[PDB]
Design an enzyme around this catalytic site. Structure first.
Site, mmCIF file in Angstrom:
data_model
loop_
_atom_site.group_PDB
_atom_site.id
_atom_site.type_symbol
_atom_site.label_atom_id
_atom_site.label_comp_id
_atom_site.label_asym_id
_atom_site.label_seq_id
_atom_site.Cartn_x
_atom_site.Cartn_y
_atom_site.Cartn_z
ATOM 1 N N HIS A 83 -1.795 8.242 2.883
ATOM 2 C CA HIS A 83 -2.750 6.861 2.188
ATOM 3 C C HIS A 83 -3.493 6.341 2.594
ATOM 4 C CE1 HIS A 83 -3.275 3.031 0.439
ATOM 5 N NE2 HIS A 83 -3.208 2.501 1.626
ATOM 6 N N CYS A 113 0.831 -0.832 0.356
ATOM 7 C CA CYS A 113 -0.359 0.036 -0.397
ATOM 8 C C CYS A 113 0.794 2.121 -0.071
ATOM 9 C CB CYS A 113 -0.802 -0.079 1.540
ATOM 10 S SG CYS A 113 -2.564 -0.307 1.267
#
Lengths: 389, 389
Positions: free
Chosen positions: A303, A163
């Site tokens: 993120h 990620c």
């Protein structure tokens, strides 16, 4: 003649800029408010009353409204080995993603190339990033073929990254663009959750968290140094520095294994706590050389791994509620699209800034930060400079 | 101050050099001459008399003498599902390689770091490449941990790349080293064939080619620009340019799929013919800018995919028999170690040059070329300059 003269002629002069951004998602989507009922039905788990209640709370707390999903109900009815918690299913999962990941990436790339406005023959490098399947030749090759790029594009295939890799691809593209005169780098992040989708288990609640958060999407950039205004190139953001670090005391916090049952995730530590405890050390390393200590003076891209990460970073740093607006908008409308998510957030930020008439592409501010978070625990930190509007 | 002033201070001045090379292999090894008998015995396939004859001819023509293999007879006896042609076995294969790939990589890296002679805290970047398994965090993280590098090393994890990626890691390392002042890049390629080993079948002979050629090994480099002679740094080779291309009319020549049965390879076209028919275009592109046209004036490193590639390139270009000596030595003594192989060949060449007392690390010549060949069909072309001895 000399190696030094060759080197200076070969390299670019200025900082790498993001010259275009395009995004795409599967048309099919699910509304989060209805997802607990759908998920427990299609996984044949409606008798798991207490577990469904827990999952309803997870979905309600996620702050996600909508998630795009290549996987449909009609497909999953024909594929009960993917609906199981743990049944042999990697071959079917791979069969989906090795096709659909580059196809979705192409949709984003076409949009990015149209905005850039230059011929695709001017692309010199391709960076493709996914956590959804692996194959040889890679998705990078498939994208090159789907777009009809020159056969001599210099490709980098980033598989199984996780990620944080939206930051990684920017770090890669920066060096490629800056070290090669005339280089124009097509960066594509494309994520399809067919390799991670699975049914529920009341002894694996971390696995259930992923079923509430992960979603599908792709984003594409053009990155280059030395933009040519005369042919219509215009940077949106400029990259200044890119760093990566492993957080202390985080071993095993998030592991992900590719097995015969597909991709499985496992959580062993408080990830929001680890990120918020340590993020200031990354901010200091990035911005002390620039004389910046007020984190509210930056435009922010983080993120959106889940809402608790964002909430705890905001509290720890004393960020104004507005700083995470673009990030939370993407989380709400698209969910956690792994590596692509921060590139959606860059797009949202520059579009809103333009619509509002503010002074720069970064909400009117000069300096910005982009964070990727992922297994390791790894943190990617990119310093950005906005462009005047 | 300005972004341009930041950029010029941030980047390195000169060409990237290879400052150290180390290699490692599993101690366990097989002699190719005995391998047809061993392979058909351990897979309980001795009744396949005609197929064994075919495989014997493949092994005898391979020109390989010795191959190192982590997988032992004792292990295979306890794991007969890895000896079947197509039994579910990915999980067992992953369990092996997610551990053994970074461990073998560490063994090579320790040797490279010792030769380099500088503190491991001076490593700023890590590039890890393998075609043997995937995991999250990756082998790059595991290697960082095993060696005790700084947690802020900038890592790039290249998974599922295939045989051309020895050229790819040089191309990546070149841009990392040249674009970042002071950067020192630890490059590791590590391959363990436990993911591809399987029993024989008359429904799949191209898998048999792989069983004759592939072998285990790891190689590590230190790559950096602006060598510091005051602390004993000295380049072995200097990189001048790095290119990648896809050969015309080569679609589907070599495919590799990661499935529940492990990694399977599929061959469809005349790979030696495709490489030898097109390699001159890569040479012309790389060397016309340097005024070089005589391919026998170069020192040569070519990925030893199999002997027919090397033989047909030699014939098509008119190379003297001596040009492929270092390449064929590594093929004979180690087999096809996928991405690591060309790095072993660099080590062989510079070691033989020093031993023989010739004028440069590249067999006494000034300019050289390194080729990676792999799925695509992809050709990586790196132009090298030797260093005086």
């Amino acid at each position: 003649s000399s190696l030094d003269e060759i080197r200076q002629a070969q390299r670019a002069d200025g900082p790498a800029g993001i010259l275009a951004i395009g995004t795409a998602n599967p048309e099919n989507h699910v509304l989060q408010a209805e997802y607990p009922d759908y998920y427990f039905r299609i996984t044949n788990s409606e008798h798991m009353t207490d577990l469904k209640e827990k999952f309803k709370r997870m979905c309600d707390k996620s702050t996600i409204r909508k998630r795009h999903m290549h996987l449909t109900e009609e497909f999953l009815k024909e594929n009960p080995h993917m609906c199981a918690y743990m049944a042999p299913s990697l071959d079917t999962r791979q069969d989906i993603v090795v096709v659909e990941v580059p196809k979705l990436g192409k949709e984003a790339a076409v949009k990015a190339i149209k905005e850039w406005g230059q011929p695709k023959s001017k692309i010199t490098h391709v960076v493709f990033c996914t956590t959804s399947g692996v194959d040889m030749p890679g998705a990078d090759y498939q994208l090159t073929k789907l777009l009809g790029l020159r056969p001599s594009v210099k490709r980098l295939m980033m598989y199984q990254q996780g990620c944080f890799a939206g930051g990684t691809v920017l770090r890669i593209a920066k060096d490629l663009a800056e070290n090669n005169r005339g280089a124009r780098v097509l960066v594509v992040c494309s994520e399809i959750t067919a390799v991670t989708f699975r049914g529920p288990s009341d002894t694996h609640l971390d696995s259930l968290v992923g079923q509430a958060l992960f979603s599908d999407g792709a984003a594409a950039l053009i990155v280059g140094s030395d933009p040519d205004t005369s042919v219509g190139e215009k940077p949106i953001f400029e990259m200044v520095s890119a760093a990566q670090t492993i957080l202390p005391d985080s071993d095993g916090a998030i592991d992900g294994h590719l097995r015969e049952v597909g991709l499985t995730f496992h959580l062993l530590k408080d990830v929001p706590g680890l990120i918020s405890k340590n993020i200031v050390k990354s901010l200091d390393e990035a911005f002390k050389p620039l004389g910046i200590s007020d984190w509210n003076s930056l435009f922010w891209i983080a993120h959106p791994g889940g809402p608790a990460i964002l909430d705890q970073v905001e509290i720890k740093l004393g960020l104004k509620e507005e700083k995470m607006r673009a990030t939370r908008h993407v989380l709400s409308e698209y969910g956690n699209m792994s590596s692509a998510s921060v590139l959606f957030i860059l797009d949202e930020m520059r579009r809103k800034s333009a619509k509002d008439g503010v002074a720069t592409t970064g909400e009117g501010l000069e300096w910005g930060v982009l964070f990727g978070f992922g297994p390791g625990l790894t943190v990617e930190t990119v310093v950005l400079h906005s462009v005047p509007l």
